[PDB]
């Protein structure tokens, strides 16, 4: 499945911008046809939307992947949003510690 | 991108640093002072008593 | 909406955020003042015994 794989060629600093915060973001996975729910709520979603944050950034062609970066205070109604726009609630950053490990773990596998 | 909206909230984050190191100094240098001039009042008292 | 006005608010965030950081400053220096007041005033009270 493309929604349970872990990621490991996406997450980067240029998308993940992990600094003195200021910050909240989130993957999305959504279909291709419910595409319009969220291309079409570009800007009417909420406040305290980043620009560019939104625009095409990357597409499975059956799920469609951004970064949806909103503040650090206001996280509670996009939260509370998340589970009635089906947003993969997949907390992911950018952090090698966790990235490492899973490679590390099938090759051991294998070798074993 | 991550350079609208962040970026210039770095410099404000910077600057925020900055006027927290401010403050935090300010309070080392009242509580010195402050024992400093505890320290020296009394010593004033004190040459005031052997004068007496 | 348009990109102009989503970066009117974020011009509202870096103003907030050195808001935020000038006004814990001078909560800081507030309570720097008074802990200044109130050490300084202990160990007055203290020798003025000491040496009476």
């Known amino acids: 499945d493309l929604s ?18 200021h910050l909240t973001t989130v993957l999305v996975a959504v279909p291709k046809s419910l ?8 800007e009417t979603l909420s406040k305290n939307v ?15 992947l951004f970064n949806v970066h909103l503040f650090k205070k206001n996280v ?17 950053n950018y952090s090698e510690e966790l990235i490492d490990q899973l490679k590390k773990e099938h090759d051991s596998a294998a070798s074993l | 991108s991550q350079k609208n909206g962040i970026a210039t909230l770095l410099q404000a984050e910077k600057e925020a640093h900055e006027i927290v190191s401010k403050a935090r100094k300010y ?5 010195k002072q402050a024992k400093t001039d505890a320290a020296k009042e009394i010593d004033s008292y004190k040459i005031q008593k052997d004068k007496e | 909406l348009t990109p102009n006005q989503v970066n009117d608010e974020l011009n509202k965030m870096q103003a907030f955020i050195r808001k935020e950081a000038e006004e814990k400053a ?18 007055v009270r203290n020798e003025t015994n000491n040496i009476d």
């Not at chain 1, 349970?4 to 915060?21: A, G, Q, T």
């Not at chain 1, 980043?50 to 469609?64: F, H, N, R, T």
């Open chain 1, 76 to 92: 509670q109604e996009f939260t509370t949003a998340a589970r009635e726009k089906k947003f993969i609630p997949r907390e992911f």
């Open chain 3, 26 to 43: 001078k909560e800081i220096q507030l309570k720097a003042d008074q802990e200044y007041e109130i050490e300084k005033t202990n160990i």
């Open chain 1, 50 to 64: 980043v620009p560019a944050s939104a625009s095409v950034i990357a597409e499975d062609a059956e799920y469609v």
């Open chain 1, 4 to 21: 349970v794989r872990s990621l490991h060629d996406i997450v980067k600093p240029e998308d993940f911008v992990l600094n003195s915060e």
């Open chain 2, 27 to 31: 309070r080392q240098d009242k509580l």
């Open chain 1, 35 to 42: 595409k319009s729910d969220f291309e079409k709520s570009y």
